Structures are given as structure tokens and as C-alpha cells.
Amino acid sequence: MATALYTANDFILISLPQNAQPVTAPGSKTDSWFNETLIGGRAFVSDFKIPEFKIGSLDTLIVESEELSKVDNQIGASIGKIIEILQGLNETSTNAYRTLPINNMPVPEYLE
Amino acid sequence: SQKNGIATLLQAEKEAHEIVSKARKYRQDKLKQAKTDAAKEIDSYKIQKDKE
Amino acid sequence: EQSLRVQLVRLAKTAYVDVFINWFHIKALRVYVESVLRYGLPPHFNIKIIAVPPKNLSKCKSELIDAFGFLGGNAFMKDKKGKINKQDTSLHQYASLVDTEYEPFVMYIINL
Amino acid sequence: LTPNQVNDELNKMQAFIRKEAEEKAKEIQLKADQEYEIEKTNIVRNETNNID
Amino acid sequence: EFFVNYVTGVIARDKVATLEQILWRVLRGNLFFKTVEIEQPVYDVKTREYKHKNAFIVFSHGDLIIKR
């Protein structure tokens, strides 16, 4: 889901294998049959670009997952502290430069 | 069904055993043949040098 | 203080934007881990993204998430689901990294 | 448990096991070849030294 | 019956389903879970009274999972 509160949107990722199906009506597969299923015919549903990463053990899998999760959430808190100190700088009375074209580029796509 | 478990677990162990035994004996034979062919090469070279 | 603020604002915002990318790539990698665990052999699939206006999660997730969980399991069905961790007993941890009771798929909080 | 999960995992753990076996293979070839090279270059020098 | 180092244990029949299901996802359910009821269990020890339990049987070929 999301965490911020602005004139912006929210985003999620999900695991969907090939054997899986978007079961709401029979006779279809993954990519199709899910275009406006999410109410409104307004959203835009895409995939994520990432290849394999060479791995030796599942016991490895678990350890890298744990340490990552740790640092991930730690830096999430770090970026929260950042936005805090940026507001302290108060470039604008309200929050500034957030939701503005990210890296000078319109925000919506700049993650997709 | 006990033979199913016999085969399944024994194969699970013996796959690791086979790959490890390969990793071992492959290099063991490599060392042996390396010693043999190094010896014959150096001996032949010694002979050719002795010719002059 | 004048120079300090006026320069550190741009420096901090620049670091902020350049970081965002890796700050989210790490969680992309996390979900890739989640995948290679949950469905393994083909390390990638339609690990789908979502883009939809906010303030709508209540009636924009339940049906599809529950259906995909239904497909993801064939031996358990209950009513309460989630991720939280409460140090009450062995129950009530809800992850694949910590204990869990009923949590088929994987998603997360994604927002700039 | 359920056919799909077992189908995936049973094969995938052994897939990683054989990836590790491949890593062992590469390691053994590399080290054996390096040993080959160093032993050859060490015996040949001494052979030529004695010869000369 | 099944479907070097192996782990087979019991837990009091009060939290058995707990780990029974935890392993299902934290461990991917990657071990063929097999537990059985106990014929006429006996007294527990700590406060020294009676209880029931079950006997899970767990194989493996991953290693550190065992330390987990």
C-alpha cells in the first residue's frame, strides 16, 4: 500500500506465478481478464522488471532476506527522518518538492 | 509404504554423496595423471637435451 | 545560516531523489526473494504492479487478494488475515520470516 | 502437502544443489589446472637447471 | 512411512497446530509434515499433571533449516 498524505497516489506489488489465474470468470489467463477488474476502469496495472540473481542455497535465501528486510526498514525510517528535517528546513510552509515532477519528471510514471 | 521412503531419502542423500565424490575423485585422478604426464614429459625433455 | 540553508536544501533534495531508486529497488529484490520462495523454479513471473487513485483500498483489494490466496492454498480457510506481530503467544506473527497463520501472497507498503 | 508446492520445491532444492555441484566442479577444475601449471613450471625449471 | 541428520519431535497438544502451520509458510511448508496422535499419553512434568501431544516426523536435505 502507501504511507504518505499528499496530492499523490498509492502503489503495491504482488506475487503472481504463471500457473495462477485471475479467477473471477472461467476461460482466461493472467494478463487478460484483469484490465478494469479493479473498480473504475481508471487504474493501470503493470509488471516489474527484474531478472534472476544467482543463488546457492535456500538457507542463503533466508539470511539475505532477513538482513535485507532489516536494512530496508532501517532506511525507510532514515528517509522519514530526512523528510522530517527537510520540513524543518521549511523550504515551503507546507511540504515542498514532494509529489512535484520527480527528478524534474512528472511523478506518476517516474516509478513505473 | 516404506520402500518409497527408502528410495526417496536414500536418493536425496546419495545425490549429494555422488556430487561430492565426483568433486573429490575427479581432482584425485587429475593429480595422478598430471604427475604421470609431467614425469614423462620432463624425462623425454631431459633425453632430448642429453642428445646435444 | 543563509548559505547553509540555501545550499543544503538543494543538496539534500538531490540526495533524496537519487536514493529513492535504490530505496525501492531493495524491496523489489525482496519481493523477488518472496517469489523464488513461494513458486520457485521460474524465478520470475507477472509480479504485478498497481496504479490506482488513493483512499480506495477497502473496496479495491479484498476480492482479488482473497481469490489469489484461495488459489495459493488448498487446505485452510479462515476469516482473520494480516501481517501484524504481537508478542502474545506462538500465534499472531504473520510472515514467512517470523511465524504466521494464514498469509498466502506477498505485497507491501509502496509509496514515494 | 499440495501438488503444486511440492512439485516446485522438490525439484528446486535439488536444482540449487546441482548449481552448488557446478560451483564445486568449476572450483576443482580451476584448482587442478593451476596445480598442473605450477608443478609443470616448477619441475621444468629444475630439470633445465640440472641439465645445463 | 515417509513422503543423515533428521529431526523428529513432539509438542503438547495445545500449540501443535501452531508450528504445524507456521512451517507451512515460513519454511514454505518445504518439509513433508507427518505427525500422529499419541496412544494413551501420560503425565507432563513441570507442574506434573496429564496432557496430550502429537509426534511430528520431519525429514530434510537443507541443513541450517535444522538450526532454525
Short-list A109, C91, C73, E56, CA closest to D1: C73
All three cell numbers of A102: 520527480
Of all residues in chain E, the one with the smallest CA distance to B2 is E1
- Taking the C-alpha atoms of residue C57 and residue C48, their distance in angstroms, rounded to an integer, is 16
Burial class (CB in 10 A: 0-12, 13-18, 19+), B38: middle
CB contact under 8 A, D2 and C73: yes
Q: Is the distance from CB of C97 to CB of C106 less than 8 angstroms?
A: no
Tell me the shortest Cα–Cα distance from C37 to chain D, in angstroms. 8
Contact residues, chain D, for E28 at CB < 8 Å: 5, 9
Q: Report the C-alpha gap between E63 and A94 in whole angstroms.
A: 54
Q: What is the signed CA dihedral for C72, C73, C79, C82, rounded to 10 degrees?
A: -50
How many whole angstroms separate alpha carbon D20 and alpha carbon E1? 30
How many inter-chain contacts (B to E, CB under 8 Å) are there? 18
Strand partners, E56: E9, E35
Q: Do B5 and E3 touch (CB under 8 A)?
A: yes
Q: What is the DSSP letter of C94?
A: -
Cα–Cα dist A57/D16, whole Å: 6
Which residues on neighbouring strands pair with residue C51, listed in sequence order? Answer: A11
Structural element, H or E, at residue C65? helix C58-72
A56 touches chain D (CB under 8 A): yes
Q: Taking a C-beta distance cutoff of 8 angstroms, is the pair C19, A86 a contact?
A: no
A38: cell is 479493479
As a whole number of angstroms, the distance between CA A38 and CA C63 comes to 9
How many other CB atoms are found less than 10 A from the CB of residue A1?
A: 14
How many other CB atoms sit within 10 Å of the CB of residue E64?
12
Helices marked H in B1-52 — which ranges? 2-51
Burial of E25 (0-12, 13-18, 19+ CB in 10 A): buried
What are the cell numbers at B44?
A: 623425454
Give the closest residue to C54 by CA, choosing from A108, A110, A111. Answer: A108
Chain A residues within 8 A of E60 when measuring between CB atoms: none
Q: How far, in Å, CA of C44 to CA of C41, rounded?
A: 9
Reported resolution in A?
A: 6.6
Distance from CA of E26 to the nearest CA of C (A): 4
Question: Which residue blocks in chain A are alpha helix, DSSP H?
Answer: 58-89
Q: Do chains C and B touch (3 or more CB pairs under 8 A)?
A: no
Measured between alpha carbons, how far is A58 from D17 in angstroms, rounded to an integer? Answer: 10
Which amino acid type is present at position E37?
Answer: E
Q: Please state, in angstroms and rounded to a whole number, the distance separating the CA atoms of residues C34 and A61.
A: 9
Between chains, do B19 and D51 touch, taking CB under 8 Å as contact? no
Cell 527484474 sits on residue = A50
Cα separation, C17 vs C10, whole angstroms: 11
**Chains A and B touch, using 3 or more CB pairs below 8 Å:** no
- Determination method here? cryo-EM
Sheet strands side by side (includes E53-58):
E7-12, E53-58, E34-37
Distance from CA of C47 to the nearest CA of D (A): 17
Phi, psi angle pair for E24, to nearest 5° = -55, -30
Which among C41, C15, C23 is positioned nearest to C112, based on CA atoms? C23
Report d(CA A36, CA B37) in Å as an integer: 72
SS3 A11: strand
**A31 phi and psi, to 5 degrees?**
-60, -45
Q: Are E55 and E8 in contact (CB under 8 A)?
A: yes
Annotate chain D with three-state secondary structure.
CCHHHHHHHHHHHHHHHHHHHHHHHHHHHHHHHHHHHHHHHHHHHHHHHHHC
The 3-state DSSP class for residue A42 equals coil
CA-closest candidate to residue E6, choices C49, B9, A93:
B9
Q: CATH number of C43-112: 3.20.20.70, 2.40.37.10, 3.40.50.300, 3.30.70.1180?
A: 3.30.70.1180
Neighbours of E19 (CB within 10 A): 18
State the Cα–Cα distance between residues A43 and C11, nearest whole angstrom: 34
Q: CA D30, CA D32: separation in Å to the nearest integer? A: 6
Phi, psi (deg, nearest 5) at residue A15: -90, 120
- Classify the phi-psi angles of A11: left when phi > 0, otherwise alpha if psi is within -120 to 50, otherwise beta: beta
What value, to the nearest 5°, has the Cα angle with vertex C14 and ends C12 and C16? 70
Say if the Cβ atoms of C41 and D12 lie within 8 Å.
Answer: yes
Cell of D37: 601449471
**Contact assignment for C100 to E22 by CB distance below 8 Å:** yes
CA distances to A5, A102, C7, C110 from A89, rounded to whole Å, are 19, 19, 11, 26
Which three-class secondary structure state does DSSP give residue E12? strand
Euclidean distance between CA atoms D48 and A37, whole angstroms: 81
Contacts of C75-79 with CB under 8 Å at 24 or more apart are C75/D1, C75/D2, C76/C102, C76/E21, C76/E24, C78/C102
Distance from CA of C88 to the nearest CA of A (A): 22
Check if the beta carbon of residue E34 is closer than 8 Å to that of residue E3. yes
Instruction: Residue C74: list chain D partners with CB under 8 A.
Output: 2
* H or E element, residue C20: helix C2-38
